[PDB]
Design a protein around this ligand. Structure first.
Ligand SMILES: Nc1ncnc2c1ncn2[C@@H]1O[C@H](COP(=O)(O)OP(=O)(O)OP(=O)(O)O)[C@@H](O)[C@H]1O
Ligand SMILES: Nc1ncnc2c1ncn2[C@@H]1O[C@H](COP(=O)(O)OP(=O)(O)O)[C@@H](O)[C@H]1O
Ligand SMILES: [Mg+2]
Lengths: 341, 99, 191, 321, 94
């Protein structure tokens, strides 16, 4: 039968550290997606509709990773689009039907399978409203009909969306859309709404909580002030939020996931039959250095690579080197690892 | 909007055949067209028309409500507001029923 | 005067030339030391500490002197903030200008080769009118300021208080070399 | 088999001269990449990800030559792309995977070879955003479709190694803004070592999107070629200009020779143009056009000596018969 | 440009027979001489140079397209619209 939301989350924990509430939202939505797909479609049966998601989170928190990790066990077509590549219909650039074109290409152009697929639209915040806004509000307007039920006309994987063009009819009624983006200036809007206060001897001054706390209480009013049109927010009823990664999340990302960076280099060192070991202080230092540079989980790979460069240059020649040890000094200082024979 | 003027009104459209791209001639004279849309900034235009909102001693002042009543304002919409919103009169005249 | 506008490459940002130099941690004290000119120096010193508490601040001085209290606001700000305040004498550093020059971080007090540095006891910090009781009070306050300035100058120059009391009795003009030998500056720049 | 990081540098020293730090960095990253591509990519194993390289160096330093030499060594296909050939407006997607069509054409459209190939992207700094977003989406794992070799073909670029490079001109001042005391002060730092300490915040301030920096973990720097290296380049490499023109004169009965002062002067002339070893070919051809036209007419000639006066002055090469 | 580059570099072309069985033609040894009046090239070069100057001690200054064409660089032709891989295959510039 279908995988329960708990089982879906269990396979998201092997790849994503933290963000439990968004994992709940994604799992429940995918479970309801399956149930809707196998719900009888005729007779006295009630007609079900979909509940799309708006996945809000800071840069490098795990939105694109949540989608990729969810796609491994979807059993339905899945794609990852980027709203920044879209434009208004009559202007140079990609149209919103190219998303369905990609979704249709992932499933051997079987329309019956694409009409039941899932779509992730990244950088949904970069098309915000704030003359003709071909790259912003125009894309939001073009997505309104596509997100909800419509019959799109897509090109056959070959060209643009032209009048002199052969087309395929795809019904996006049962296609689940997952929008995501790093609404940077959203914390300011939420703070303006929740901490209005006022000026004057007779005015009431309101008390004056970072990106995580404010995102956890986001409302459509803030998303409208940010630049999203209400017609789009109404089509994204579910709003899931990601917590920004801290130092402890970074060290867990280094060690805990199935294909974690430490496991990456451990397996890479198992090729030449040597053991790679990281001290706890070494991982804590890598996390501090990735945080101080304000990179996030993006920069952990650069740190480990720059620390193991000179040792990897000498791996296939150093015979008898049973173990390699990375200490706190190797991370913080310009030192070389310990090479135990 | 200009391209829809002759389509809504009676014309003869030349469309491709049933299969690949003789074109087919279709007369849209008896084809009923039902346009629809959420004119977002329309209530502000209707309010600016009906509510002067002037300044001074000789101007009647009324901005005592922050949010425009969309229902009451839409109920008194006229082609003047749709023209100031962005629609052309040639299209409004072809849409005589405003529900 | 028309202050020229310069373009910083980063996109581009247009600065007046003094804001552009402040971006490089250069603070100018030009002309007399007043409440307003001293508070601008204090505002710049406070701002530069926030930008980077570790990098040196360069305090360029071309001043004939001014108010003691105004100069003391600069002086205490220089000593309070974490980053070293290097001082450079351009043209002249006289009276409180010489005091603030000697107030720079020891080892980082500079003067240009043809600059003129003048030290002297303070003049009127304010008028001495009213009754003899008021004049006695203002005379006592001026003497306390005179001793405080000589004491801080002697500390800056690694000299005895008795030396500064002799040398500040009347206007003591010094070349950059004489100020270096005296202890007001540490180095003389050439190139 | 597979060449070790030491053997890669050994064979790569014959074609490129200098930039030893970038040489070993490329060797390690490439060896690790093509060892990851030999992992048991199935089961309960660890899914291995690639590590791309960012080559920062002046023009004519040999970045493209480094990438092409690595490709020739490892039998993989290679195509150079130019971020300057990608426009802001339009279908940045449709032309960003045309590079895949180029790479496929270089290997008989066999996806098995192209998916494990190398791609060099020129002028990575000249795009300091839509182009950056497309290069990011392509550097990361994605399945792109292109026309056939004559039905469409699929290419997954996850296993393709990407070596981006460019001459970050104003990056050194972005670094000096945080590494030195001051710029405009009297005594305040008035003006590749600082390129060696480049950090992600410098590249981001330069205008590179952070997600692109995140997929370019290896940063290698190339030093400007001095007047000495430009002489070796003229004589030492496998495809040295002196060697090429000596073969041109050698298919006939004339031995071409250069004076050491001629090589030094022509290297200084190339260095004065701010183009590195790229300008060496034009000045050598200019210098040898004196005889390449007359040599057909000359009879009884045995050798030609190219002196420094030919490169510096309007002098003719000495013709000894 | 790409279909032309695929010929200028060493490849094998398939062409109809001598009569109405295609012939394989290897173009490794076929010399290509391309030409044209690059009307935008003088502006491209004049943007690369022609810095000029202001003041008394500075040199101040119809386009001299003769000397401009005499100082063409491959990047100028790239700006004109030619693919870099084609210019790299055209080393001789007359
Ligand atoms: N919660 C997490 N668990 C494990 N890895 C993570 C997590 N968050 C980020 N990463 C690491 O960061 C890299 C990219 O993160 P990701 O693309 O998911 O961030 P993002 O939310 O998409 O950022 P942006 O909003 O800028 O697109 C991944 O390769 C992953 O290894
Ligand atoms: N380090 C080097 N060693 C040998 N030849 C070089 C080197 N650097 C540049 N060249 C020569 O310069 C020409 C073009 O260099 P290029 O690859 O464009 O450098 P970059 O990619 O750094 O701009 C090549 O023909 C190459 O022979
Ligand atoms: Mg992402």
């Amino acid at each position: 039968k279908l995988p329960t939301p708990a089982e879906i989350v269990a396979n998201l924990n092997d790849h994503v550290i933290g963000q439990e509430q968004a994992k709940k939202a994604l799992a429940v939505s995918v479970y309801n997606h399956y149930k809707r797909l196998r719900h009888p479609k005729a007779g006295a049966n009630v007609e079900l509709s979909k509940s799309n998601i708006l996945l809000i989170g800071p840069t490098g928190s795990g939105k694109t990773l949540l989608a990729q990790s969810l796609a491994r066990k979807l059993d339905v077509p899945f794609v990852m689009a980027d709203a920044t590549t879209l434009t208004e219909a009559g202007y140079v650039g990609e149209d919103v039907e190219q998303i369905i074109t990609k979704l249709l290409g992932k499933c051997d152009f079987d329309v019956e399978k694409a009409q039941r697929g899932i779509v992730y639209i990244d950088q949904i915040d970069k098309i915000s409203r704030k003359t003709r806004d071909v790259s912003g509000e125009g894309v939001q307007q073009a997505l309104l009909k596509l997100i909800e039920g419509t019959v799109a006309s897509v090109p056959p994987q070959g060209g643009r969306k032209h009048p002199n063009q052969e087309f395929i009819n795809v019904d996006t009624t049962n296609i689940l859309f997952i929008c995501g983006g790093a609404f940077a200036g959203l914390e300011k809007v939420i703070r303006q709404r929740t901490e209005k206060g006022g000026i004057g001897f007779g005015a009431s001054v309101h008390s004056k909580a970072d990106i995580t706390k404010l995102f956890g209480i986001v409302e459509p009013e803030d998303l409208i002030k940010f630049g999203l049109i209400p017609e789009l927010i109404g089509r994204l009823p579910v709003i899931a939020t990601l917590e920004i990664l801290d130092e402890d999340a970074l060290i867990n990302i280094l060690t805990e996931p199935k294909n974690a960076l430490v496991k990456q280099y451990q397996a890479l060192f198992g090729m030449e039959n040597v053991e790679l070991e990281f001290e706890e202080g070494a991982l804590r230092s890598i996390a501090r250095q990735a945080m101080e540079r304000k990179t996030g989980a993006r920069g952990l790979r650069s740190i480990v690579e720059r620390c193991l460069l000179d040792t990897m240059y000498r791996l296939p020649d150093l015979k008898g080197l049973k173990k390699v040890v990375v200490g706190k000094a190797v991370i913080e200082e310009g030192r070389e690892p310990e090479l135990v024979f | 909007q200009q391209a829809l003027l002759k389509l809504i009104e009676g014309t003869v459209a030349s469309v491709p055949p049933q299969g690949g791209r003789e074109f087919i001639n279709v007369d849209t004279t008896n084809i009923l067209f039902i346009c629809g849309g959420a004119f977002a900034g329309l209530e502000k235009v209707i309010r600016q028309r009906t509510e002067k909102g002037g300044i001074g001693f000789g101007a009647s002042v009324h901005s005592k409500d922050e949010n425009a009543d969309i229902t009451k304002l839409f109920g008194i919409v006229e082609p003047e507001d749709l023209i100031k919103f962005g629609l052309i009169p040639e299209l409004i005249g072809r849409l005589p029923v405003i529900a | 005067y028309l202050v020229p506008t310069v373009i910083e490459q980063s996109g581009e940002r247009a600065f007046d030339i003094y804001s552009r130099l402040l971006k490089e941690r250069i603070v100018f004290l030009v002309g007399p030391v007043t409440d307003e000119s001293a508070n601008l120096v204090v505002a710049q010193l406070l701002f530069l500490e926030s930008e980077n508490p570790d990098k040196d601040i360069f305090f360029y001085i071309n001043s004939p002197g001014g108010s003691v209290t105004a100069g003391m606001s600069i002086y205490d700000t220089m000593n309070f903030i974490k980053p070293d305040v290097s001082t450079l004498c351009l043209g002249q550093a006289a009276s409180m200008g010489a005091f603030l020059l000697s107030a720079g971080e020891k080892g980082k007090r500079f003067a240009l080769p043809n600059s003129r540095i003048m030290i002297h006891q303070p003049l009127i910090s304010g008028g001495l009118g009213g009754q003899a009781s008021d004049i006695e009070i203002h005379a006592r306050e001026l003497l306390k300021i005179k001793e405080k300035l000589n004491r801080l100058m002697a500390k800056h120059c690694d000299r005895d208080l008795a030396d500064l009391e002799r040398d500040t009795d009347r206007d003591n003009f010094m070349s950059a070399e004489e100020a270096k030998e005296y202890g007001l500056i540490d180095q003389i720049l050439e190139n």
